[PDB]
Amino acid sequence: TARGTPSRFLASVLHNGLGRYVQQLQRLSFSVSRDGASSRGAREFVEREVIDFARRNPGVVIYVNSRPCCVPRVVAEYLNGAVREESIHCKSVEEISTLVQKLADQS
């Protein structure tokens, strides 16, 4: 709902359009586990695409915990420090690739 939810005027972070463009995604912190059937999407995503994702984006930094977790998580913070966590529980590798891609795209 518009009235129940806050609002804002449209604005970019420090006018990233005129000057050199900078990928405004700072960090990605994956939380996977050596066990748990739900982590098949994240682990296979770590095998194939996270490598190429780093080669494509040298600016962004990536961390992987690989600890016991009943549900895998992925945490993403930006230059402004705005933390945004999303659940990748029981998701395909294709969905996770599009999910991490739009996270890299957004500010």
Partner 1 sequence: PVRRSEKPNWDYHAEIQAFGHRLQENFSLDLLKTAFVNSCYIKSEEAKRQQ
Partner 2 sequence: LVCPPLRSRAYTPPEDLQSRLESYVKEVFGSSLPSNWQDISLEDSRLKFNLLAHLADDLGHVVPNSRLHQMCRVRDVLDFYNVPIQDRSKFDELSASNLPPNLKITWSY
Partner 3 sequence: PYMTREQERGHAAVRRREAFEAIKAAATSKFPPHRFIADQLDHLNVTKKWS
Q: Which residues bind partner 2 (CB under 8 A)?
A: 34, 46-47, 50-51, 54-55, 58-68
* Residue 91 binds to partner 3 (criterion: CB under 8 A): no
The identity of residue 67, as a single letter, is: R
Cβ neighbours, 10 Å, residue 22: 11
* Residue 40 binds to partner 3 (criterion: CB under 8 A): yes
The identity of residue 65, as a single letter, is: N
Site string for partner 1, 59-78 (x = CB under 8 A): xxx-x-x---------x---
Residue (16 or 66) nearer to partner 2, CB: 66
Task: Find the Cα–Cα–Cα–Cα dihedral 5, 6, 7, 11, rounded to 10°.
Answer: -120
Distance CA 13, CA 24 (A): 8
Show Cβ contacts of residue 51 under 8 Å, excluding neighbours closer than 6 positions: none
55: partner contacted, choices partner 1, partner 2, partner 3, none (Cβ within 5-8 A by kind): partner 2
* Residue 35 binds to partner 3 (criterion: CB under 8 A): yes
40: partner contacted, choices partner 2, partner 3, partner 1, none (Cβ within 5-8 A by kind): partner 3
